[PDB]
Amino acid sequence: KELVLALYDYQEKSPREVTMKKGDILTLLNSTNKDWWKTEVNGRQGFVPAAYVKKLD
After folding, report:
1. What is the C-alpha separation between 51 and 40, in angstroms, rounded?
2. Number of domains composing the chain
3. Exposed, middle or buried, 18 (CB in 10 Å: 0-12/13-18/19+)?
């Protein structure tokens, strides 16, 4: 799908979340929710704070 850029680091704080590092290029899986977007980072899926990533369209 689309690609998003991680603006900050973020360690998952819940079972459904995923961890990311600043500069990470994540595959955006679902952006229907305003605060959390589902993504795929090096081998795993989970949500991250939508505000901590930028769309690379």
Report:
1. 16
2. 1
3. buried
**Could you tell me the residue range of the domain that residue 35 belongs to?**
1-57
**To one decimal place, what's the resolution in Å?**
2.6
What CATH number is associated with residue 49?
Answer: 2.30.30.40
Tell me which method was used to determine the 3D structure. X-ray
Q: Which two tokens stand for residue 14?
A: 């819940």
**26 neighbors 19 (Cβ within 8 angstroms):** no
Instruction: Kindly write down the DSSP assignment for every residue of 10-48, as one continuous string.
Output: B---STTB--B-TT-EEEEEE--SSSEEEEEETTEEEEE
